[PDB]
PDB file of all heavy atoms in Angstrom:
ATOM      1  N   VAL H   1       0.826  -1.237   0.000  1.00 20.04           N
ATOM      2  CA  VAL H   1       0.000   0.000   0.000  1.00 20.04           C
ATOM      3  C   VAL H   1       0.854   1.279   0.000  1.00 20.04           C
ATOM      4  O   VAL H   1       2.057   1.278   0.316  1.00 20.04           O
ATOM      5  CB  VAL H   1      -1.030  -0.079   1.137  1.00 20.04           C
ATOM      6  CG1 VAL H   1      -0.391  -0.122   2.505  1.00 20.04           C
ATOM      7  CG2 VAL H   1      -2.053   1.038   1.071  1.00 20.04           C
ATOM      8  N   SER H   2       0.220   2.351  -0.465  1.00 16.70           N
ATOM      9  CA  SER H   2       0.844   3.602  -0.951  1.00 16.70           C
ATOM     10  C   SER H   2       0.300   4.828  -0.218  1.00 16.70           C
ATOM     11  O   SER H   2      -0.906   4.827   0.111  1.00 16.70           O
ATOM     12  CB  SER H   2       0.550   3.729  -2.403  1.00 16.70           C
ATOM     13  OG  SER H   2      -0.845   3.613  -2.628  1.00 16.70           O
ATOM     14  N   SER H   3       1.117   5.877  -0.073  1.00 14.90           N
ATOM     15  CA  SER H   3       0.696   7.188   0.490  1.00 14.90           C
ATOM     16  C   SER H   3      -0.588   7.642  -0.195  1.00 14.90           C
ATOM     17  O   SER H   3      -1.611   7.728   0.460  1.00 14.90           O
ATOM     18  CB  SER H   3       1.795   8.219   0.434  1.00 14.90           C
ATOM     19  OG  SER H   3       1.315   9.538   0.614  1.00 14.90           O
ATOM     20  N   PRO H   4      -0.608   7.935  -1.509  1.00 11.63           N
ATOM     21  CA  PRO H   4      -1.870   8.226  -2.181  1.00 11.63           C
ATOM     22  C   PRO H   4      -2.756   6.986  -2.376  1.00 11.63           C
ATOM     23  O   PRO H   4      -2.300   5.871  -2.375  1.00 11.63           O
ATOM     24  CB  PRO H   4      -1.441   8.849  -3.514  1.00 11.63           C
ATOM     25  CG  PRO H   4      -0.062   8.300  -3.760  1.00 11.63           C
ATOM     26  CD  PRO H   4       0.550   8.085  -2.395  1.00 11.63           C
ATOM     27  N   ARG H   5      -4.039   7.259  -2.569  1.00 12.29           N
ATOM     28  CA  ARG H   5      -5.175   6.301  -2.571  1.00 12.29           C
ATOM     29  C   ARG H   5      -5.343   5.666  -3.965  1.00 12.29           C
ATOM     30  O   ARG H   5      -6.351   5.968  -4.651  1.00 12.29           O
ATOM     31  CB  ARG H   5      -6.391   7.125  -2.123  1.00 12.29           C
ATOM     32  CG  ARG H   5      -7.662   6.359  -1.781  1.00 12.29           C
ATOM     33  CD  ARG H   5      -8.722   7.260  -1.153  1.00 12.29           C
ATOM     34  NE  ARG H   5     -10.081   6.823  -1.457  1.00 12.29           N
ATOM     35  CZ  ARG H   5     -11.058   7.562  -1.998  1.00 12.29           C
ATOM     36  NH1 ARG H   5     -10.885   8.841  -2.309  1.00 12.29           N
ATOM     37  NH2 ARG H   5     -12.236   7.005  -2.213  1.00 12.29           N
ATOM     38  N   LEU H   6      -4.422   4.789  -4.374  1.00 12.68           N
ATOM     39  CA  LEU H   6      -4.391   4.205  -5.753  1.00 12.68           C
ATOM     40  C   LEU H   6      -5.549   3.238  -5.991  1.00 12.68           C
ATOM     41  O   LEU H   6      -5.991   2.565  -5.075  1.00 12.68           O
ATOM     42  CB  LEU H   6      -3.063   3.491  -5.998  1.00 12.68           C
ATOM     43  CG  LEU H   6      -2.052   4.307  -6.795  1.00 12.68           C
ATOM     44  CD1 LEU H   6      -1.676   5.585  -6.057  1.00 12.68           C
ATOM     45  CD2 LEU H   6      -0.826   3.483  -7.107  1.00 12.68           C
ATOM     46  N   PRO H   7      -6.046   3.097  -7.235  1.00 11.82           N
ATOM     47  CA  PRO H   7      -6.942   1.999  -7.587  1.00 11.82           C
ATOM     48  C   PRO H   7      -6.127   0.768  -7.957  1.00 11.82           C
ATOM     49  O   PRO H   7      -4.969   0.896  -8.327  1.00 11.82           O
ATOM     50  CB  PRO H   7      -7.654   2.565  -8.806  1.00 11.82           C
ATOM     51  CG  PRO H   7      -6.577   3.359  -9.497  1.00 11.82           C
ATOM     52  CD  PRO H   7      -5.766   3.971  -8.375  1.00 11.82           C
ATOM     53  N   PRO H   8      -6.698  -0.452  -7.902  1.00 12.08           N
ATOM     54  CA  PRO H   8      -5.947  -1.670  -8.204  1.00 12.08           C
ATOM     55  C   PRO H   8      -5.619  -1.841  -9.694  1.00 12.08           C
ATOM     56  O   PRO H   8      -6.256  -1.236 -10.534  1.00 12.08           O
ATOM     57  CB  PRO H   8      -6.885  -2.785  -7.729  1.00 12.08           C
ATOM     58  CG  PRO H   8      -8.255  -2.186  -7.904  1.00 12.08           C
ATOM     59  CD  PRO H   8      -8.092  -0.725  -7.553  1.00 12.08           C
ATOM     60  N   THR H   9      -4.621  -2.675  -9.990  1.00 11.67           N
ATOM     61  CA  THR H   9      -4.057  -2.830 -11.356  1.00 11.67           C
ATOM     62  C   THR H   9      -3.771  -4.279 -11.758  1.00 11.67           C
ATOM     63  O   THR H   9      -3.573  -4.521 -12.970  1.00 11.67           O
ATOM     64  CB  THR H   9      -2.743  -2.057 -11.477  1.00 11.67           C
ATOM     65  OG1 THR H   9      -1.726  -2.689 -10.702  1.00 11.67           O
ATOM     66  CG2 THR H   9      -2.857  -0.622 -11.021  1.00 11.67           C
ATOM     67  N   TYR H  10      -3.751  -5.211 -10.821  1.00  7.09           N
ATOM     68  CA  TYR H  10      -3.053  -6.504 -11.003  1.00  7.09           C
ATOM     69  C   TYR H  10      -3.587  -7.301 -12.187  1.00  7.09           C
ATOM     70  O   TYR H  10      -2.801  -8.019 -12.830  1.00  7.09           O
ATOM     71  CB  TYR H  10      -3.162  -7.281  -9.707  1.00  7.09           C
ATOM     72  CG  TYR H  10      -4.393  -8.123  -9.532  1.00  7.09           C
ATOM     73  CD1 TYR H  10      -4.345  -9.478  -9.808  1.00  7.09           C
ATOM     74  CD2 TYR H  10      -5.565  -7.607  -9.025  1.00  7.09           C
ATOM     75  CE1 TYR H  10      -5.419 -10.318  -9.558  1.00  7.09           C
ATOM     76  CE2 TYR H  10      -6.654  -8.429  -8.781  1.00  7.09           C
ATOM     77  CZ  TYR H  10      -6.586  -9.790  -9.047  1.00  7.09           C
ATOM     78  OH  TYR H  10      -7.651 -10.621  -8.835  1.00  7.09           O
ATOM     79  N   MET H  11      -4.871  -7.157 -12.462  1.00  6.36           N
ATOM     80  CA  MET H  11      -5.638  -7.891 -13.501  1.00  6.36           C
ATOM     81  C   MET H  11      -5.322  -7.488 -14.953  1.00  6.36           C
ATOM     82  O   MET H  11      -5.778  -8.223 -15.847  1.00  6.36           O
ATOM     83  CB  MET H  11      -7.108  -7.575 -13.267  1.00  6.36           C
ATOM     84  CG  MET H  11      -7.423  -6.098 -13.547  1.00  6.36           C
ATOM     85  SD  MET H  11      -8.610  -5.286 -12.426  1.00  6.36           S
ATOM     86  CE  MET H  11      -7.732  -5.314 -10.861  1.00  6.36           C
ATOM     87  N   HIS H  12      -4.697  -6.339 -15.224  1.00  5.98           N
ATOM     88  CA  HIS H  12      -4.905  -5.628 -16.522  1.00  5.98           C
ATOM     89  C   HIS H  12      -4.321  -6.361 -17.740  1.00  5.98           C
ATOM     90  O   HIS H  12      -3.217  -6.888 -17.648  1.00  5.98           O
ATOM     91  CB  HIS H  12      -4.375  -4.204 -16.477  1.00  5.98           C
ATOM     92  CG  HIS H  12      -5.133  -3.341 -17.435  1.00  5.98           C
ATOM     93  ND1 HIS H  12      -4.571  -2.771 -18.558  1.00  5.98           N
ATOM     94  CD2 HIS H  12      -6.432  -2.963 -17.437  1.00  5.98           C
ATOM     95  CE1 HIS H  12      -5.486  -2.046 -19.183  1.00  5.98           C
ATOM     96  NE2 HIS H  12      -6.634  -2.159 -18.517  1.00  5.98           N
ATOM     97  N   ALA H  13      -5.007  -6.328 -18.884  1.00  6.15           N
ATOM     98  CA  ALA H  13      -4.680  -7.130 -20.095  1.00  6.15           C
ATOM     99  C   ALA H  13      -3.227  -6.927 -20.551  1.00  6.15           C
ATOM    100  O   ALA H  13      -2.587  -7.890 -21.003  1.00  6.15           O
ATOM    101  CB  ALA H  13      -5.645  -6.795 -21.195  1.00  6.15           C
ATOM    102  N   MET H  14      -2.688  -5.738 -20.370  1.00  2.75           N
ATOM    103  CA  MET H  14      -1.307  -5.451 -20.773  1.00  2.75           C
ATOM    104  C   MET H  14      -0.318  -6.370 -20.054  1.00  2.75           C
ATOM    105  O   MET H  14       0.734  -6.668 -20.639  1.00  2.75           O
ATOM    106  CB  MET H  14      -0.986  -3.997 -20.457  1.00  2.75           C
ATOM    107  CG  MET H  14       0.214  -3.488 -21.244  1.00  2.75           C
ATOM    108  SD  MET H  14      -0.091  -3.320 -23.029  1.00  2.75           S
ATOM    109  CE  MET H  14      -1.431  -2.132 -23.078  1.00  2.75           C
ATOM    110  N   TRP H  15      -0.599  -6.840 -18.848  1.00  4.32           N
ATOM    111  CA  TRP H  15       0.308  -7.816 -18.210  1.00  4.32           C
ATOM    112  C   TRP H  15       0.483  -9.057 -19.097  1.00  4.32           C
ATOM    113  O   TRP H  15       1.584  -9.642 -19.106  1.00  4.32           O
ATOM    114  CB  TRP H  15      -0.200  -8.220 -16.832  1.00  4.32           C
ATOM    115  CG  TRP H  15      -0.206  -7.134 -15.814  1.00  4.32           C
ATOM    116  CD1 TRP H  15      -1.318  -6.622 -15.220  1.00  4.32           C
ATOM    117  CD2 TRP H  15       0.923  -6.459 -15.231  1.00  4.32           C
ATOM    118  NE1 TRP H  15      -0.964  -5.673 -14.302  1.00  4.32           N
ATOM    119  CE2 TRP H  15       0.406  -5.561 -14.279  1.00  4.32           C
ATOM    120  CE3 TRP H  15       2.311  -6.565 -15.357  1.00  4.32           C
ATOM    121  CZ2 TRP H  15       1.238  -4.768 -13.486  1.00  4.32           C
ATOM    122  CZ3 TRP H  15       3.129  -5.764 -14.601  1.00  4.32           C
ATOM    123  CH2 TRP H  15       2.599  -4.879 -13.661  1.00  4.32           C
ATOM    124  N   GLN H  16      -0.551  -9.529 -19.791  1.00  3.14           N
ATOM    125  CA  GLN H  16      -0.390 -10.733 -20.634  1.00  3.14           C
ATOM    126  C   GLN H  16       0.501 -10.403 -21.830  1.00  3.14           C
ATOM    127  O   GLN H  16       1.241 -11.285 -22.280  1.00  3.14           O
ATOM    128  CB  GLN H  16      -1.747 -11.334 -20.940  1.00  3.14           C
ATOM    129  CG  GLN H  16      -2.203 -12.172 -19.751  1.00  3.14           C
ATOM    130  CD  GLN H  16      -3.582 -12.747 -19.863  1.00  3.14           C
ATOM    131  OE1 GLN H  16      -3.795 -13.635 -20.642  1.00  3.14           O
ATOM    132  NE2 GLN H  16      -4.531 -12.270 -19.083  1.00  3.14           N
ATOM    133  N   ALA H  17       0.498  -9.179 -22.322  1.00  2.00           N
ATOM    134  CA  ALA H  17       1.489  -8.778 -23.344  1.00  2.00           C
ATOM    135  C   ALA H  17       2.908  -8.911 -22.778  1.00  2.00           C
ATOM    136  O   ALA H  17       3.766  -9.429 -23.509  1.00  2.00           O
ATOM    137  CB  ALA H  17       1.193  -7.395 -23.851  1.00  2.00           C
ATOM    138  N   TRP H  18       3.159  -8.510 -21.531  1.00  2.00           N
ATOM    139  CA  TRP H  18       4.480  -8.753 -20.893  1.00  2.00           C
ATOM    140  C   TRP H  18       4.790 -10.244 -20.956  1.00  2.00           C
ATOM    141  O   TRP H  18       5.852 -10.620 -21.455  1.00  2.00           O
ATOM    142  CB  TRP H  18       4.559  -8.248 -19.454  1.00  2.00           C
ATOM    143  CG  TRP H  18       5.607  -8.940 -18.623  1.00  2.00           C
ATOM    144  CD1 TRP H  18       5.388  -9.946 -17.727  1.00  2.00           C
ATOM    145  CD2 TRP H  18       7.033  -8.712 -18.588  1.00  2.00           C
ATOM    146  NE1 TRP H  18       6.558 -10.345 -17.140  1.00  2.00           N
ATOM    147  CE2 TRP H  18       7.587  -9.605 -17.652  1.00  2.00           C
ATOM    148  CE3 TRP H  18       7.900  -7.838 -19.241  1.00  2.00           C
ATOM    149  CZ2 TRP H  18       8.950  -9.654 -17.383  1.00  2.00           C
ATOM    150  CZ3 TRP H  18       9.248  -7.870 -18.966  1.00  2.00           C
ATOM    151  CH2 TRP H  18       9.765  -8.783 -18.062  1.00  2.00           C
ATOM    152  N   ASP H  19       3.890 -11.079 -20.484  1.00  2.00           N
ATOM    153  CA  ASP H  19       4.236 -12.496 -20.280  1.00  2.00           C
ATOM    154  C   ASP H  19       4.522 -13.190 -21.615  1.00  2.00           C
ATOM    155  O   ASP H  19       5.475 -13.990 -21.675  1.00  2.00           O
ATOM    156  CB  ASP H  19       3.150 -13.175 -19.481  1.00  2.00           C
ATOM    157  CG  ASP H  19       3.619 -14.505 -18.947  1.00  2.00           C
ATOM    158  OD1 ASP H  19       4.224 -14.532 -17.849  1.00  2.00           O
ATOM    159  OD2 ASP H  19       3.376 -15.496 -19.632  1.00  2.00           O
ATOM    160  N   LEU H  20       3.785 -12.870 -22.668  1.00  2.00           N
ATOM    161  CA  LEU H  20       4.095 -13.387 -24.030  1.00  2.00           C
ATOM    162  C   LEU H  20       5.497 -12.950 -24.470  1.00  2.00           C
ATOM    163  O   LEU H  20       6.236 -13.769 -25.023  1.00  2.00           O
ATOM    164  CB  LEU H  20       3.055 -12.880 -25.027  1.00  2.00           C
ATOM    165  CG  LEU H  20       3.350 -13.236 -26.483  1.00  2.00           C
ATOM    166  CD1 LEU H  20       3.287 -14.733 -26.696  1.00  2.00           C
ATOM    167  CD2 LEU H  20       2.423 -12.525 -27.444  1.00  2.00           C
ATOM    168  N   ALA H  21       5.848 -11.690 -24.258  1.00  2.00           N
ATOM    169  CA  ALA H  21       7.143 -11.129 -24.697  1.00  2.00           C
ATOM    170  C   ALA H  21       8.298 -11.866 -24.012  1.00  2.00           C
ATOM    171  O   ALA H  21       9.309 -12.167 -24.680  1.00  2.00           O
ATOM    172  CB  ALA H  21       7.158  -9.646 -24.430  1.00  2.00           C
ATOM    173  N   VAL H  22       8.139 -12.194 -22.736  1.00  2.00           N
ATOM    174  CA  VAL H  22       9.148 -12.997 -22.007  1.00  2.00           C
ATOM    175  C   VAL H  22       9.205 -14.385 -22.632  1.00  2.00           C
ATOM    176  O   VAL H  22      10.313 -14.853 -22.899  1.00  2.00           O
ATOM    177  CB  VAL H  22       8.856 -13.080 -20.505  1.00  2.00           C
ATOM    178  CG1 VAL H  22       9.874 -13.957 -19.801  1.00  2.00           C
ATOM    179  CG2 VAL H  22       8.867 -11.705 -19.890  1.00  2.00           C
ATOM    180  N   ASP H  23       8.076 -15.040 -22.847  1.00  2.00           N
ATOM    181  CA  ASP H  23       8.108 -16.418 -23.385  1.00  2.00           C
ATOM    182  C   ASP H  23       8.811 -16.454 -24.746  1.00  2.00           C
ATOM    183  O   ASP H  23       9.675 -17.325 -24.953  1.00  2.00           O
ATOM    184  CB  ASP H  23       6.705 -16.977 -23.508  1.00  2.00           C
ATOM    185  CG  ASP H  23       6.736 -18.414 -23.979  1.00  2.00           C
ATOM    186  OD1 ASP H  23       6.922 -19.305 -23.127  1.00  2.00           O
ATOM    187  OD2 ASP H  23       6.600 -18.624 -25.195  1.00  2.00           O
ATOM    188  N   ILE H  24       8.468 -15.534 -25.640  1.00  2.00           N
ATOM    189  CA  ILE H  24       9.129 -15.387 -26.970  1.00  2.00           C
ATOM    190  C   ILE H  24      10.642 -15.313 -26.763  1.00  2.00           C
ATOM    191  O   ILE H  24      11.370 -16.082 -27.409  1.00  2.00           O
ATOM    192  CB  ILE H  24       8.542 -14.169 -27.703  1.00  2.00           C
ATOM    193  CG1 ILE H  24       7.175 -14.549 -28.270  1.00  2.00           C
ATOM    194  CG2 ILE H  24       9.468 -13.630 -28.783  1.00  2.00           C
ATOM    195  CD1 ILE H  24       6.418 -13.430 -28.944  1.00  2.00           C
ATOM    196  N   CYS H  25      11.092 -14.458 -25.859  1.00  2.00           N
ATOM    197  CA  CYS H  25      12.527 -14.261 -25.569  1.00  2.00           C
ATOM    198  C   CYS H  25      13.153 -15.576 -25.083  1.00  2.00           C
ATOM    199  O   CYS H  25      14.026 -16.143 -25.770  1.00  2.00           O
ATOM    200  CB  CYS H  25      12.655 -13.142 -24.553  1.00  2.00           C
ATOM    201  SG  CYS H  25      14.363 -12.963 -24.003  1.00  2.00           S
ATOM    202  N   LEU H  26      12.646 -16.123 -23.991  1.00  4.66           N
ATOM    203  CA  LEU H  26      13.294 -17.282 -23.329  1.00  4.66           C
ATOM    204  C   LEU H  26      13.046 -18.600 -24.094  1.00  4.66           C
ATOM    205  O   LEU H  26      13.646 -19.606 -23.709  1.00  4.66           O
ATOM    206  CB  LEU H  26      12.835 -17.331 -21.867  1.00  4.66           C
ATOM    207  CG  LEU H  26      13.102 -16.064 -21.050  1.00  4.66           C
ATOM    208  CD1 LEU H  26      12.783 -16.299 -19.579  1.00  4.66           C
ATOM    209  CD2 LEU H  26      14.542 -15.599 -21.205  1.00  4.66           C
ATOM    210  N   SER H  27      12.321 -18.610 -25.213  1.00  2.54           N
ATOM    211  CA  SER H  27      12.319 -19.764 -26.157  1.00  2.54           C
ATOM    212  C   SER H  27      13.716 -19.985 -26.754  1.00  2.54           C
ATOM    213  O   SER H  27      14.051 -21.145 -27.042  1.00  2.54           O
ATOM    214  CB  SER H  27      11.319 -19.562 -27.254  1.00  2.54           C
ATOM    215  OG  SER H  27      11.745 -18.538 -28.142  1.00  2.54           O
ATOM    216  N   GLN H  28      14.498 -18.916 -26.922  1.00  3.29           N
ATOM    217  CA  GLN H  28      15.794 -18.928 -27.659  1.00  3.29           C
ATOM    218  C   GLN H  28      16.969 -19.197 -26.711  1.00  3.29           C
ATOM    219  O   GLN H  28      17.933 -19.875 -27.105  1.00  3.29           O
ATOM    220  CB  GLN H  28      16.031 -17.568 -28.306  1.00  3.29           C
ATOM    221  CG  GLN H  28      14.850 -16.978 -29.066  1.00  3.29           C
ATOM    222  CD  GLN H  28      15.219 -15.603 -29.577  1.00  3.29           C
ATOM    223  OE1 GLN H  28      16.331 -15.369 -30.050  1.00  3.29           O
ATOM    224  NE2 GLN H  28      14.292 -14.661 -29.491  1.00  3.29           N
ATOM    225  N   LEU H  29      16.898 -18.646 -25.505  1.00  3.49           N
ATOM    226  CA  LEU H  29      18.027 -18.598 -24.549  1.00  3.49           C
ATOM    227  C   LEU H  29      18.626 -19.983 -24.291  1.00  3.49           C
ATOM    228  O   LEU H  29      19.843 -20.050 -24.193  1.00  3.49           O
ATOM    229  CB  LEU H  29      17.573 -17.892 -23.271  1.00  3.49           C
ATOM    230  CG  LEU H  29      18.685 -17.545 -22.293  1.00  3.49           C
ATOM    231  CD1 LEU H  29      19.674 -16.571 -22.892  1.00  3.49           C
ATOM    232  CD2 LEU H  29      18.111 -16.957 -21.029  1.00  3.49           C
ATOM    233  N   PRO H  30      17.881 -21.121 -24.224  1.00  2.00           N
ATOM    234  CA  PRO H  30      18.491 -22.449 -24.065  1.00  2.00           C
ATOM    235  C   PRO H  30      19.514 -22.860 -25.138  1.00  2.00           C
ATOM    236  O   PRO H  30      20.295 -23.755 -24.874  1.00  2.00           O
ATOM    237  CB  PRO H  30      17.283 -23.410 -24.085  1.00  2.00           C
ATOM    238  CG  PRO H  30      16.149 -22.572 -23.545  1.00  2.00           C
ATOM    239  CD  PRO H  30      16.416 -21.215 -24.170  1.00  2.00           C
ATOM    240  N   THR H  31      19.535 -22.193 -26.297  1.00  2.00           N
ATOM    241  CA  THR H  31      20.656 -22.311 -27.271  1.00  2.00           C
ATOM    242  C   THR H  31      21.635 -21.136 -27.141  1.00  2.00           C
ATOM    243  O   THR H  31      22.830 -21.404 -27.121  1.00  2.00           O
ATOM    244  CB  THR H  31      20.179 -22.443 -28.720  1.00  2.00           C
ATOM    245  OG1 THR H  31      19.655 -21.196 -29.176  1.00  2.00           O
ATOM    246  CG2 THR H  31      19.156 -23.543 -28.908  1.00  2.00           C
ATOM    247  N   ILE H  32      21.170 -19.890 -27.035  1.00  2.00           N
ATOM    248  CA  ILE H  32      22.045 -18.668 -27.040  1.00  2.00           C
ATOM    249  C   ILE H  32      23.157 -18.804 -25.992  1.00  2.00           C
ATOM    250  O   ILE H  32      24.278 -18.361 -26.260  1.00  2.00           O
ATOM    251  CB  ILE H  32      21.217 -17.386 -26.796  1.00  2.00           C
ATOM    252  CG1 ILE H  32      20.153 -17.173 -27.875  1.00  2.00           C
ATOM    253  CG2 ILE H  32      22.120 -16.151 -26.667  1.00  2.00           C
ATOM    254  CD1 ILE H  32      19.046 -16.227 -27.452  1.00  2.00           C
ATOM    255  N   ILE H  33      22.841 -19.386 -24.841  1.00  2.00           N
ATOM    256  CA  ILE H  33      23.780 -19.550 -23.697  1.00  2.00           C
ATOM    257  C   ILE H  33      25.010 -20.353 -24.142  1.00  2.00           C
ATOM    258  O   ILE H  33      26.074 -20.195 -23.514  1.00  2.00           O
ATOM    259  CB  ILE H  33      23.031 -20.221 -22.521  1.00  2.00           C
ATOM    260  CG1 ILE H  33      21.914 -19.333 -21.948  1.00  2.00           C
ATOM    261  CG2 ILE H  33      23.991 -20.682 -21.426  1.00  2.00           C
ATOM    262  CD1 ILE H  33      22.379 -18.231 -21.004  1.00  2.00           C
ATOM    263  N   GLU H  34      24.875 -21.208 -25.157  1.00  2.00           N
ATOM    264  CA  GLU H  34      25.837 -22.315 -25.418  1.00  2.00           C
ATOM    265  C   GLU H  34      26.268 -22.347 -26.885  1.00  2.00           C
ATOM    266  O   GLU H  34      27.489 -22.386 -27.142  1.00  2.00           O
ATOM    267  CB  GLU H  34      25.179 -23.637 -25.026  1.00  2.00           C
ATOM    268  CG  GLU H  34      24.627 -23.632 -23.614  1.00  2.00           C
ATOM    269  CD  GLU H  34      24.106 -24.960 -23.100  1.00  2.00           C
ATOM    270  OE1 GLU H  34      23.511 -25.718 -23.899  1.00  2.00           O
ATOM    271  OE2 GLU H  34      24.301 -25.232 -21.895  1.00  2.00           O
ATOM    272  N   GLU H  35      25.305 -22.303 -27.803  1.00  2.00           N
ATOM    273  CA  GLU H  35      25.506 -22.576 -29.250  1.00  2.00           C
ATOM    274  C   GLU H  35      25.869 -21.289 -30.011  1.00  2.00           C
ATOM    275  O   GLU H  35      25.748 -21.297 -31.261  1.00  2.00           O
ATOM    276  CB  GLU H  35      24.240 -23.231 -29.812  1.00  2.00           C
ATOM    277  CG  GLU H  35      23.800 -24.478 -29.052  1.00  2.00           C
ATOM    278  CD  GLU H  35      22.817 -25.396 -29.783  1.00  2.00           C
ATOM    279  OE1 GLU H  35      21.981 -24.891 -30.575  1.00  2.00           O
ATOM    280  OE2 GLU H  35      22.889 -26.633 -29.565  1.00  2.00           O
ATOM    281  N   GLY H  36      26.296 -20.218 -29.321  1.00  2.00           N
ATOM    282  CA  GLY H  36      26.688 -18.928 -29.931  1.00  2.00           C
ATOM    283  C   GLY H  36      25.594 -18.331 -30.805  1.00  2.00           C
ATOM    284  O   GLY H  36      25.926 -17.531 -31.701  1.00  2.00           O
ATOM    285  N   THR H  37      24.332 -18.672 -30.538  1.00  2.00           N
ATOM    286  CA  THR H  37      23.163 -18.292 -31.368  1.00  2.00           C
ATOM    287  C   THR H  37      23.028 -16.765 -31.415  1.00  2.00           C
ATOM    288  O   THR H  37      22.823 -16.147 -30.359  1.00  2.00           O
ATOM    289  CB  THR H  37      21.877 -18.917 -30.815  1.00  2.00           C
ATOM    290  OG1 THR H  37      22.115 -20.245 -30.347  1.00  2.00           O
ATOM    291  CG2 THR H  37      20.789 -18.981 -31.859  1.00  2.00           C
ATOM    292  N   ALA H  38      23.097 -16.169 -32.598  1.00  2.00           N
ATOM    293  CA  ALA H  38      22.799 -14.729 -32.774  1.00  2.00           C
ATOM    294  C   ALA H  38      21.294 -14.522 -32.553  1.00  2.00           C
ATOM    295  O   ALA H  38      20.501 -15.035 -33.368  1.00  2.00           O
ATOM    296  CB  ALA H  38      23.248 -14.277 -34.138  1.00  2.00           C
ATOM    297  N   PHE H  39      20.891 -13.822 -31.491  1.00  2.00           N
ATOM    298  CA  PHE H  39      19.478 -13.869 -31.025  1.00  2.00           C
ATOM    299  C   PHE H  39      18.537 -13.054 -31.928  1.00  2.00           C
ATOM    300  O   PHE H  39      18.917 -12.023 -32.539  1.00  2.00           O
ATOM    301  CB  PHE H  39      19.365 -13.471 -29.555  1.00  2.00           C
ATOM    302  CG  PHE H  39      18.985 -12.040 -29.291  1.00  2.00           C
ATOM    303  CD1 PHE H  39      17.667 -11.692 -29.014  1.00  2.00           C
ATOM    304  CD2 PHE H  39      19.947 -11.044 -29.330  1.00  2.00           C
ATOM    305  CE1 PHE H  39      17.334 -10.374 -28.751  1.00  2.00           C
ATOM    306  CE2 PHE H  39      19.612  -9.729 -29.057  1.00  2.00           C
ATOM    307  CZ  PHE H  39      18.313  -9.399 -28.751  1.00  2.00           C
ATOM    308  N   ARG H  40      17.280 -13.508 -31.936  1.00  2.00           N
ATOM    309  CA  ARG H  40      16.145 -12.934 -32.695  1.00  2.00           C
ATOM    310  C   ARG H  40      15.442 -11.873 -31.834  1.00  2.00           C
ATOM    311  O   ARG H  40      14.904 -12.188 -30.766  1.00  2.00           O
ATOM    312  CB  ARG H  40      15.257 -14.098 -33.141  1.00  2.00           C
ATOM    313  CG  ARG H  40      14.180 -13.732 -34.143  1.00  2.00           C
ATOM    314  CD  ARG H  40      13.684 -14.974 -34.879  1.00  2.00           C
ATOM    315  NE  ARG H  40      12.958 -15.917 -34.021  1.00  2.00           N
ATOM    316  CZ  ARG H  40      13.395 -17.096 -33.553  1.00  2.00           C
ATOM    317  NH1 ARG H  40      14.600 -17.561 -33.840  1.00  2.00           N
ATOM    318  NH2 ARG H  40      12.596 -17.829 -32.793  1.00  2.00           N
TER     319      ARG H  40
END
C-alpha cells in the first residue's frame, strides 16, 4: 500500500502482453547460452 489512494491494477490485459514477450525471448536462450546463437 501507498501514500496516495491508488486503484488496483493486477488484472490488466497489458500484463499478458508482458508475459508473451518474455516467453518469446526465453524460447531462444536455451541455445544462445551455449551454441553462440545470434538472437532474434
Side-chain angles (χ1 to χ4, degrees):
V1 64
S2 53
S3 164
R5 191 171 149 234
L6 260 62
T9 70
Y10 87 98
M11 67 218 65
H12 207 246
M14 199 69 60
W15 294 116
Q16 279 175 71
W18 156 260
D19 195 87
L20 174 65
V22 178
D23 183 83
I24 283 176
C25 174
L26 303 188
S27 71
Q28 313 177 41
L29 190 63
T31 72
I32 300 161
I33 294 281
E34 307 187 323
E35 306 197 328
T37 321
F39 97 98
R40 191 160 67 254

